[PDB]
């Protein structure tokens with residue numbers, strides 16, 4: 122119930138929402154069927170449209186008009202945005218030359234530059250170039266301010282998950298808005314763009330910017346807008362709020378446009394019908410900037426022009442149907458379209474089998490345009506698992522395609538030519554970022570970055586302390602003239618031990634054998650020096666990683682590699698080695714095929730054992746430093762130390778061996794040397810964070826040797842590839858991966874072929890940021906470089922995507 126019989130007189134677009142059954146006059150009242158009887162009349166004026174004309178100049182104020190051209194309109198804050206242009210001979214903002222904004226130039230009473238966030242739905246990155254001729258206001262913001270060539274959305278590349286990620290700095294698995302529609306099995310309820318369910322605050326986790334601002338005494342405009350409020354009225358409303366008294370005026374404002382997404386769905390991303398919506402959004406930017414310039418705020422406000430995701434060509438005829446794969450298609454519920462999520466139609470059904478559903482969907486047709494995954498097996502870079510609203514079964518759909526349950530679902534809803542929701546690495550899903558104002562840099566291009574980073578920046582722009590989030594604060598300092606944020610390295614929690622030779626061979630009963638008893642004063646001092654860390658500056662180029670949790674570990678030095686060996690997990694946490702452009706690949710000699718050697722620096726009780734591997738018929742082992750890349754036949758013996766061994770499924774060893782034998786050397790050749798840091802990851806509860814020992818669900822049979830869920834590598838070289846990795850004077854270049862440690866290669870449909878036909882494709886799919894590895898390991902990398910910490914934070918957030926240009 123609402124008693125809608127009160128009035129909006131003097132309350133139009135009030136900032137504080139009043140509680141039922143009192144009637145409302147705020148920008149959301151329409152959506153709730155709760156506005157006062159006179160809201161349309163008083164608050165949604167439309168008479169005479171949105172522009173001043175010559176004949177309206179200096180008119181007698183008529184309070185019925187949409188906006189005003191009367192002399193008193195500047196005082197009242199309610200002129201048409203072009204008033205000064207038409208009636209006072211001023212120029213439109215877009216026609217002014219651009220001039221550096223070195224300091225904020227704000228009216229008296231402004232305590233800080235306001236932030237206006239102008240969000241555009243479906244605004245694909247390449248619109249900036251391709252629509253440049255029809256978007257002069259946007260193109261001015263872009264060339265004069267700070268811009269990226271594109272901004273990476275979060276997965277799924279849908280509207281609500283991305284807008285709410287922009288507001289919170291959180292992955293959708295953390296904020297809870299995991300799709301445009303979602304079912305919560307605990308609420309037994311579904312969230313959709315339509316209807317009232319989305320209104321309940323129970324769906325919306327984290328702390329969005331408006332709440333962060335309010336808690337810290339910074340006032341915030343409403344970020345949600347009722348769809349029927351036209352754009353011109355949203356702009357006028359922002360400009361009116363900006364004219365409020367100092368104690369009442371918000372410092373942060375949001376404008377949202379449903380375009381170009383709305384037309385993009387109908388016409389495709391580059392349909393000829395798309396020119397007009399781009400012109401119309403540009404005109405709305407023009408209105409805002411002219412409006413700001415009238416209020417003398419155009420060199421005071423920081424403006425962010427940001428999109429939520431792009432748009433791809435997608436038609437009804439490119440739909441894969443599940444009824445073409447499954448027989449029990451009526452026992453499932455599918456969230457369809459540009460991603461798939463499958464769950465049981467009934468929870469009272471104990472004969473529903475996720476395993477058999479997955480198998481019936483795997484590599485079934487040679488051209489198949491989707492891939493099924495258990496959610497925990499999805500690429501870690503998607504961060505799309507740790508929420509009860511994400512179904513166990515996930516389908517990653519190829520760009521340009523849809524998935525649906527049955528044909529009747531498509532014709533009983535061709536409508537559409539565009540859609541979005543695909544993997545956030547896809548070029549067509551990339552969106553835009555422009556920042557313009559006194560706190561942003563002038564005429565500056567920044568590298569592409571992820572939208573999860575922007576919350577920290579918007580907090581910096583507002584003098585706010587951000588709530589805990591998934592951004593890496595400091596990684597976008599290079600966007601800002603001032604207000605940076607001064608990041609500092611996390612303190613190391615565990616310091617390493619440096620063990621010497623402490624154990625005789627015969628103290629070990631590891632059930633290991635090696636053919637290594639072949640017997641010089643020149644080269645015995647030499648080997649001693651190597652074990653003490655003589656070559657460490659060659660193989661550890663950026664300092665040892667810091668361990669950020671409490672544990673017991675040893676640094677072990679070798680001629681060819683250095684490692685941080687965990688006495689708790691019985692294996693290295695990290696192994697670091699450099700491979701120069703000139704390095705040679707060798708074989709594992711025949712006599713050394715099954716060689717594993719006790720490490721006399723490490724106790725029998727903190728070592729793995731070969732017997733466990735012999736007894737575990739599913740589990741084999743591999744090595745973190747590859748024996749193929751030994752510097753000499755003598756150094757090769759170090760590669761077979763028990764302290765370099767890790768548990769590996771035979772299926773995974775195919776992947777790993779190819780990476781180590783072929784790919785590392787290829788990268789060293791291409792990049793002029795590489796430094797590699799490799800190691801295990803344990804994430805059995807799929808939360809993206811390092812497992813404690815008591816979370817491990819799988820051990821090597823009859824041992825305390827834990828089985829990794831993933832293996833990582835971070836591959837660093839010089840950005841200036843004329844300099845070798847080990848003698849690099851300037852910025853660095855990195856690519857990294859987090860490979861799932863799986864007992865089959867069901868994910869790679871061509872895995873029956875030679876590794877040269879599928880391994881690198883798998884690794885590319887599982888590309889990662891250094892920061893993703895840091896969360897999963899509790900390690901902190903690049904502790905000792907000649908580069909600024911802000912720069913290193915940018916480096917740690919980089920993702921190598923392997924998309925074309």
Ligand SMILES: *[C@@H]1O[C@H](CO)[C@@H](O[C@@H]2O[C@H](CO)[C@@H](O[C@@H]3O[C@H](CO[C@H]4O[C@H](CO)[C@@H](O)[C@H](O[C@H]5O[C@H](CO)[C@@H](O)[C@H](O)[C@@H]5O[C@H]5O[C@H](CO)[C@@H](O)[C@H](O)[C@@H]5O)[C@@H]4O)[C@@H](O)[C@H](O[C@H]4O[C@H](CO)[C@@H](O)[C@H](O)[C@@H]4O[C@H]4O[C@H](CO)[C@@H](O)[C@H](O)[C@@H]4O)[C@@H]3O)[C@H](O)[C@H]2NC(C)=O)[C@H](O)[C@H]1NC(C)=O
Nearest residue numbers: 294295296297325326327507508509589590591808809896
């Ligand atoms: C991305 O950034 C985010 C933000 O920093 C990181 O997420 C944080 O991760 C922390 C560790 O996982 C986590 O801390 C836990 O908080 C528990 C209290 O949580 C509530 O309060 C906070 C703060 O206001 C709130 O944000 C939480 O919101 C979640 O849940 C609501 C619904 O209740 C959702 O609306 C919302 O979207 C959000 O959901 C997400 O997080 C939860 C987990 O909290 C997931 O389950 C969801 O799927 C979704 O992802 C909560 O309202 C606190 O109880 C925990 O403490 C336990 O563990 C420690 C171990 O040291 C122990 O000392 C404690 O005693 C306690 O153990 C006891 O409880 C156990 C569990 O019930 C039990 O088994 C034990 O036996 C004990 O009795 C813990 O500190 C923090 O909440 C989230 N924050 C957010 C916003 O998600 C995220 O990790 C980053 N991602 C990456 C990859 O880096």
Ligand SMILES: COCC(=O)N1CCC(c2ccc3c(c2)C(=O)N(CC(=O)N(C)Cc2ccc(C#N)c(Cl)c2)CC3)CC1
Nearest residue numbers: 149152281284285288319320321325344345346347348377
């Ligand atoms: C914790 O916060 C929850 C809250 O305060 N709520 C109260 C408001 C209620 C509500 C009420 C009414 C509506 C809508 C939501 C609603 O979604 N639309 C659609 C819509 O605005 N856009 C598509 C654009 C949009 C703009 C910004 C963001 C963001 N960040 C997002 Cl995600 C979307 C308009 C109608 C939801 C719950």
Ligand SMILES: [Ca+2]
Nearest residue numbers: 242243280429
């Ligand atoms: Ca959208």
Ligand SMILES: [Ca+2]
Nearest residue numbers: 804810811812
């Ligand atoms: Ca974990």
Ligand SMILES: [Cl-]
Nearest residue numbers: 279300301302
């Ligand atoms: Cl969805």
Ligand SMILES: [K+]
Nearest residue numbers: 734737738740
């Ligand atoms: K075995």
Ligand code: NA
Nearest residue numbers: 866867869872
């Ligand atoms: Na396969």
Ligand SMILES: [Zn+2]
Nearest residue numbers: 243382386541
């Ligand atoms: Zn859309």
